[PDB]
Symmetry: D2
Subunit: 505 residues, 4 copies
């Protein structure tokens, strides 16, 4: 006899868990409950704030929704027109003193001519190989070089992805990138070079909306608030410490035990295996690879410098900086940093100098959010990484030596990226089925470990589709067919389906 019993138990109130709970709440048939060890929902889509009042997401978080369901829930949670700000998807690659518009290969006219000649020769080779190709690429590296050619590969995607994944490109699968043939568009690349043209992959219709307040985490707080309070349990009181798969019982930190018939676990699957004391599953989940994510934030005094402008996020293939991505987070919402009348002392100059004065002076302020990856193949000195990042900002000309830093943030997230290693699927197809057999739907960015469906919308839907499978016999498409859900706008499943309509009648 456990203290609580429900039909379906959801561990975790990240996007994936909140999805489950939303669908469960919409269906309102089987009983359910959601728990989380954090008092605040959001998981890796949470947001911190520095004591100086600079918000930081867990690194660059831009929403692109493949599902009208996701949209419905965001619209419900933040329904007002100024709950959101709309921006173009403006991104660039830092290469050889230049801000190269994404996509890199369409903009190498900004590079020295001698370099363009190397790139184009490289891609000519790739086009001619691609014309007679009858195998699929087996690694991320093959995919890159087949798609880009050697010169362009070496300039960007190759060193960039090591910096991103903290594993070399030769060690990753490439199926996760979808069905597009690994072949170059040689005409597009040569055309822009010939025309001396630059062109980004954004415009009036390639946008994203970002929450006005609270950062990305404001979304998930608001979504969570729509759920019936009593069916939630967040904080130390919601910490799962034991899962008895055989007895279908979960134990919490405070000794409270929960009976379930179906388990949706959105905690990391290596953690769940531990919570199960399933030795075999601990072995299997230890074979999975992941990188850790250091997020570093810098609050800078002054209005937005011309050189920064409308830039949103930025990729960094070169090694004069430790970060792989920078976000101009102050561009996402004016409320991601203090108002210009907020007085802050300067903490340091970007070159590391003490400020001439320690007096609190006003803004306006802008803000840079950096990401650094860590793994057993790429260590990160936690003591010096902030300074390395700030030096990185100077080296990349994001900051002048004189720019005034007024806030710093550094947090290290254990599970950051789940890595599409060559061995991933071989391992996941041993883990997920055994959990399934015990009526455990383990889902999410580290629930099911599949990056290609690891964004907020994917996660959210992984939870929804897990619930729909449990209840309505629906296919878990996001889980098992990433190319399908990413290749279409999923419009059928809505926050109001015909069931709720016919029922109110």
């Amino acid at each position: 006899h456990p203290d609580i019993s429900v039909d379906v138990l959801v561990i975790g109130a990240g996007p994936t868990g909140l999805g489950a709970a939303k669908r469960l709440n919409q269906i309102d048939g089987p009983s359910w409950m959601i728990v989380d060890s954090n008092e605040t929902p959001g998981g890796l889509a949470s947001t911190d704030v520095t004591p100086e009042g600079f918000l930081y997401d867990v690194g660059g978080h831009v929403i692109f929704s493949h599902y009208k369901y996701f949209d419905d829930c965001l619209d419900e949670a933040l329904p007002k027109e100024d709950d959101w700000y709309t921006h173009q998807r403006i991104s660039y690659v830092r290469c050889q003193g230049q801000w190269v518009p994404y996509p890199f290969q369409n903009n190498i006219s900004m590079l020295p001519k001698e370099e363009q000649v190397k790139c184009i020769d490289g891609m000519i080779d790739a086009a001619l190989e691609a014309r007679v190709a009858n195998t699929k690429p087996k690694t991320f590296d093959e995919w890159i070089v087949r798609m880009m050619g050697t010169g362009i590969a070496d300039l960007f995607m190759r060193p960039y992805n090591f910096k991103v994944w903290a594993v070399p490109t030769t060690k990753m699968q490439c199926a996760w990138l979808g069905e597009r043939v690994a072949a170059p568009n040689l005409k597009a690349v040569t055309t822009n070079v010939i025309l001396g043209k630059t062109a980004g992959n954004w415009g009036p219709n390639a946008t994203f909306r970002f929450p006005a307040r609270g950062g990305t985490g404001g979304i998930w707080i608001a979504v969570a608030n729509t759920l019936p309070k009593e069916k939630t349990r967040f904080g130390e009181k919601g910490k799962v410490t034991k899962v008895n798969a055989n007895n279908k019982t979960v134990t919490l930190q405070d000794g409270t035990t929960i009976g379930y018939k179906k388990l949706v676990s959105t905690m990391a699957v290596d953690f769940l295996a531990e919570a199960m004391n399933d030795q075999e599953l601990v072995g299997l989940t230890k074979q999975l690879f992941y990188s850790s994510t250091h997020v570093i934030g810098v609050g800078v005094r002054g209005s937005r410098p011309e050189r920064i402008g409308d830039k949103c996020w930025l990729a960094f293939p070169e090694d004069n900086c430790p970060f792989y991505r920078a976000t101009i987070f102050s561009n996402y919402s004016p409320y991601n940093q203090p108002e210009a009348s907020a007085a802050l002392p300067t903490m340091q100059l970007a070159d590391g100098s003490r400020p001439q004065s320690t007096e609190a002076k006003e803004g306006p302020y802008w803000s840079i959010m950096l990401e650094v990856s860590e793994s057993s193949m790429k260590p990160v000195n936690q003591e010096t990484i902030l300074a390395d990042c700030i030096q990185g900002l100077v080296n990349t000309e994001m900051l002048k030596p004189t720019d005034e830093i007024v806030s710093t943030y550094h947090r290290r997230f254990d599970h950051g990226y789940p890595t599409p290693t060559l061995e991933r699927e071989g391992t996941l197809t041993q883990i997920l089925p055994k959990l399934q057999d015990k009526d455990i739907w383990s889902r999410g960015r580290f629930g099911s470990w599949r990056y290609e469906v690891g964004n907020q919308d994917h996660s959210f839907m992984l939870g929804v589709e897990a619930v729909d499978n449990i209840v309505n016999g629906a296919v878990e498409l996001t889980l098992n067919y990433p190319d399908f859900v990413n290749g279409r706008q999923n419009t059928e499943r809505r926050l109001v389906d015909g069931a709720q309509v016919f029922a109110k009648s």
Copy 2:
């Protein structure tokens, strides 16, 4: 106010409509009702009997299920082990006086060696061209030649498919055939030719089950039987004559009006448009192409001849018979024809002459079922078609001139096959969305006109999935993604889902 009002109205009680009925019945949420102009459910999956006691399906009907849900309803309708007979999927291609095992190209070692050279030379060209191919084939014909080469194409798939579809291969699309690359397996084909080897694509793991009694129609009668009778209206009283899509009112032949919220229509969509008196839709649907099927049944006196043996169905590329397929229907079940003891007179010899005796004599009996197709491009003489079929049975040596025919059958089904013409999708993407904008789900063999998802299981699931889209927001996978449902085991959806389990508390 209309006579009857339901949330969901289902028109038609062939496999599709029944699928919709069974899903509505299972969900047991929205009120629903199903109508049909025939007293007997089944549509083109029904079974006729001659006055002499020989059953015939609407042509060769062999179940291969892609879906667990479908299996669930069949198991439910016919739960006993002796409700079913299991057979191996044994088929042959009649070619140049010989029975060649399917797949044809793996068995051309039966042909004369000179012919084998031509065949292999053809496939060598196709192999060599496949190796540098950078375009998808645009027609059924292009597809066929790329797969097989000229020689093999001309021997079998070209003339056979004309005899099947009553249109030239050059007039059909090939996308309906799936995502498999149009390229020959040269090695397999040459290998069997070198080894002088024949090999069928059947065996103990490639089987089908057939109803013990009542033909294929018996399935659907039994599936209907599990529905609540009051929600069914089958016969003259159930014939739809008028659909008013703006009123969401249907009018039956006997004057009965049924008001609906959502319509699942499984009648031929060109008929639906007429019933709607929607001239725009009439014009659109008139642009679709279909063949008619003539079904010819022949009952023969005698134990099953050795030349026939365990043969199930048979393909006929050649001109010496008008039918494209023959089914040894007496192999599918002993109850498809009378017991040996039944006394029946001989109607005629297979060579068309009068029998030596007018007297009723005993069996055993066997039975052959034939399909002749017909279209505007392939007229059929309806007056000579029976004798032409029988003569064809003699020409192909399925019947000896002296064989005694004790029963004959001929029926013409106007909508037999929805033709994958080059124009089909262009027309359908005008029709199907325009109907769904009026909350009409037009689904099924001629409801949505897609042969590639046009078997009994497909149809059934088009009904099920239509309902699941209407009620639960499910993706209509079978409708819009034939390659997807056909390329997997569709296991998630069951006759008992978690919903029904959690409910029963």
Copy 3:
């Protein structure tokens, strides 16, 4: 019995005939002589002079020597260092107001960026096609597009070659172009586009030498001069009017009969068939195709304009002028036009106006030589072609409207170019062996009709090798293997061979 008897008779005393005569003379075995209807040897390699003292060759003649033998005779004919001037092989294509250095495709960076894009895109298609090509091209046109791509083909080689050959490129074979695979050097073309590089195919090591005096005609006058006079018969006295192959008898216009053992005929082979009164051969020779050449010469007052500079010959694909080639003939030798002190009146300005003043003014002078083709598919209006050419020089900015023309030249040459039509080889293979079997060696530009071996050195060597075959069993490499002789330095055969050295002992 004939008036004259020799072992080997040579008809014609252009380069081919003189070649024969030179080798016969060197060998000094078989008796021989040479006739020509012209009192001045040289054929199409002769030179005219206007009454005003401007020299014109039969269009642009630039020697590239594939053979040492040819060099030896040229050296012997004109031994003095100052019998020659050396120039680099400088040449341009006129296109869109620009002088584009040859090779055209390596220099399209002078064209507008939008033209460049078109050019590269075309070449990218051709490169991709070449990667999977497994057929040789069949026509000149196919060859061109495979080498260059559409855009580049259309800018230069297609319309240029129509203006050259007076037949469309589609009507010509392409084997005459050599054995190089028809594929683009896409990398070289893009690289020069990217770098904004121009690069002409000339320099210190790509030169030609030109007679200091008498034009190209000076060469052959001086070569003929080394022959023993008594074995020549040049002028009216040497015109061949009848050839009796069966009798091995040639008749001259003055009644002189010459019996021969072997005939080397270098006259146009259609002319030979008429002289043979051989209706079969006349029939075959009429199936050959040739164009006529209009040579236009323009003498111009003034020191050589800077816009002209050291230009040698120039190509004109465009239809703003009738000529296909212009030669700055005054660059070849200072004695191709009068000294600066020579006094000439202005005949007309380039704009076509004739000035009132007959005042003879001094020089210096420069000189343009132009070529316009004519054929049955390309009529030339002889009455206006001079004025059209001159307007062409103004259209192409070679002449200012105000430039003063002091001399004009125009002459039509019936047989100008032997055309590499599709049918050429088929026809020649009937003609040349038939003549062979009669001991007639028909050789030379129109003797054997092969442009690819139709230059002065080739022609000369066709004579030499015909004699060497006749006397010494030598292979006629130049005749039957143009690729072989053009792909090597032919150094083995000299004006002094061992035979002569050993004999002088």
Copy 4:
């Protein structure tokens, strides 16, 4: 001041040297002399005879002539039709108990079926690669696999050519094999397999003629006897022991010195280097590679066994015998072995037994000529090679254990094959130009070291073409352009050219 002085000196009276002489004699201009260390001309084209009366060439010699000149000299030497026998070019490959008709790949239907499958699969791979090939093979081995596919390659050409060349196929170049594309005729191979055809590449047109008497050597004795005797010095008196390049003087065994103006040396070029005492040259010629040849001859008692029949020569890829080639020498001429009434004792039976009787018995007789290769990569035990060859004959079912042997022959020829190693051209293009600079035409099978022009006719013509270069400036086509001479009928150079016709007038 030398003992004798000539214009041209020929060292060697093998085919190459005799060619030079024959041409020198024909021209009858420059003075000349020919020497050889052997009293009997022929070199490796000579014929030995055993004490028992069995003739043996230096292994299988079969004439295929690319030249009319060669034919002329042969016809002159042996003019009666009685002097020659004509035979169809009948050869087989010994493979797994079968005699497989050349060409091997067109006849694998004699092999087990399972193996035909391996072969065809392998060649199918090759055809698919060839369709997309963009590079020429770099080695003999790459050439073989690209032509034949793996399986066919392993069965024959790979193991065979190591047995022929005594170097692995990976060590040799492939240009020597000519300009044909390295690609399979897939349809020809599959066609014969399907049809079960065993088709030989010989017929009433594919013939060779072989001398009636004296074997191959009889040819060259007869050609030599046409030379003015006094200009020949053959035997110990004609042995060259010294070549002083700078004095243009040769010194003979007895002391006789000869001054030349030009030298044609047909001795092996490593021997020439030595005779020149040129250090640099010796170094270079030592870097050339060559295989030695062991010729084994077996005289057998009895009429030609049925199993042998009309076989001419036979190739042996397999490891159960040491020879690469057998020749049924008794098939070439009835005079290659004693007449039937010739009495001979049996030396041994083929299994090695002593014969039952020691007395001489009559014939008739037949005869087998075997070839074994030797090199630093493939030693040959000279003491046992005869016995191993005889065992080979039993192993290959060429001889029964009971077959009686009445003669044995073994002889080792040091310079056997000049090897087309990868390094061959690098070395030769460093040697021949230096000899050329000293007025030394080093020519022939080991004079110029090129197997692809290393047959009797090539060798002859190498000598002829060297003379014609020396005297008449002729191109040395056979020397520098093997693909050219071999790809054509060389008919222009005759034993009586025009020069000799015109001189007798």
